[PDB]
Design a protein around this ligand. Structure first.
Ligand SMILES: N[C@@H](CCC(=O)N[C@@H](CS)C(=O)NCC(=O)O)C(=O)O
Ligand SMILES: N[C@@H](CCC(=O)N[C@@H](CS)C(=O)NCC(=O)O)C(=O)O
Lengths: 218, 218
């Protein structure tokens, strides 16, 4: 009747974003695993600008970038509640915080396990401040999108999959500094859509241990 | 009535995006120059999270981040031509190439004037290649938005006023490689809304000379 395809790689938090969006909005689709070393002809022709995953393919037209995909899902499949607020203002706030996750959480998270020594130390410090800022925005609400899970939650919660990696490689403990965030991420894991879309934390960690060796930054 | 204020820094291309979107949508507002290394109390109140300009303040409420502000304007002031395409699939593409500027153009741009030797030149190569990808998507249309100036145009064209500075400190010539891009940039400047919002290229260059000295880097 139209069909959709998601080109993804199991441990990508960016890909889990789109997996969760599609779940929440009830969209049926086939999932196509990729090899980041052996990129498919489909991948190259669908995202010829970045040759990266995820890519949502809708009736033969591609959409690139996890966050933009989510928004597209949200604007095209409207049988379920919107994931972004309808109010211009709040929506602007969601975009900011969903974006905050890319610019801060991912960027600093990646430095924790790629960098070393004092630099790695710096990366851990900013990482925690960033989570705390997000903790502020969450306040007392059950989700970032209020009583319902919404855009920002979809942006944020896939990264729990990578928390164990960070902590272990970076030698710090998140829950210690951010009890409220961890509690949030667990309250989310109990949603079936969330637990399914996410991947196993120690499976993720092994995969990073492997990655570190193939680049020599052990 | 509505009180609109733009906290901004005059040579910022990110704020120029906003000056332009405001002008293009016919929006009356007040400007307030912000210090770069001395946050006003106002800036600190409106953007405690990043403490960066541009911030738009609409009827007391703040909106952070260039692109998101611009989306906010498109959605709030609807009595002029929409900056973002109506069709979701095309909306996604605007979102993509506007984002693309943030990630490749600015990132590689900044590296050109802040870096030396092999790293500087490496940026210029990547810089050109990204412009050439943007050329490929411009096609033969007057604007990225087609016949009418659009969201991607507003995201990209503020950077032309920095081009002379890139070209001069990096010691290369953009037109030699991307003459189409230059042709378009030049074409854009004829639109008066664009010539009022953009600042003088030589005056920007003076200001980049200004940073390179402040931090000893020439
Ligand atoms: N900025 C992209 C992230 C895409 C990304 O980084 N994905 C990686 C794997 S998780 C990829 O596609 N790999 C391409 C490569 O490594 O060259 C988004 O948020 O959509
Ligand atoms: N990501 C922001 C860019 C903000 C930005 O980088 N602006 C700079 C000046 S152009 C700034 O506010 N600098 C202040 C600081 O570094 O503290 C956007 O898209 O608007």
């Amino acid at each position: 009747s139209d069909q959709v395809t998601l080109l993804d790689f199991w441990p990508s938090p960016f890909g889990m974003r789109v997996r969760l969006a599609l779940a929440e909005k009830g969209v049926k689709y086939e999932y196509s695993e990729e090899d980041l070393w052996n990129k498919s002809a489909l991948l190259l022709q669908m995202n010829p600008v970045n040759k990266q995953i995820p890519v949502l393919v809708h009736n033969g037209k591609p959409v690139c970038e996890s966050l933009i995909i989510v928004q597209y899902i949200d604007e095209v499949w409207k049988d379920s509640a919107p994931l972004l607020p309808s109010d211009p203002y709040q929506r602007a706030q969601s975009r900011f915080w969903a974006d905050f996750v890319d610019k801060k959480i991912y960027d600093l998270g990646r430095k924790i396990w790629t960098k070393k020594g004092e630099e790695q130390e710096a990366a851990k410090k900013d990482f925690i401040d960033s989570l705390k800022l997000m903790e502020g925005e969450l306040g007392d609400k059950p989700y970032f999108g209020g009583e319902t899970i919404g855009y920002v939650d979809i942006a944020l919660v896939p990264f729990y999959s990578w928390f164990y990696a960070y902590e272990t490689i970076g030698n710090f403990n998140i829950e210690a500094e951010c009890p409220k965030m961890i509690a949030y991420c667990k309250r989310c894991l109990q949603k079936e859509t969330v637990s399914k879309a996410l991947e196993d934390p120690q499976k993720v960690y092994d995969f990073v241990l492997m990655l570190m060796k193939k680049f020599g930054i052990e």
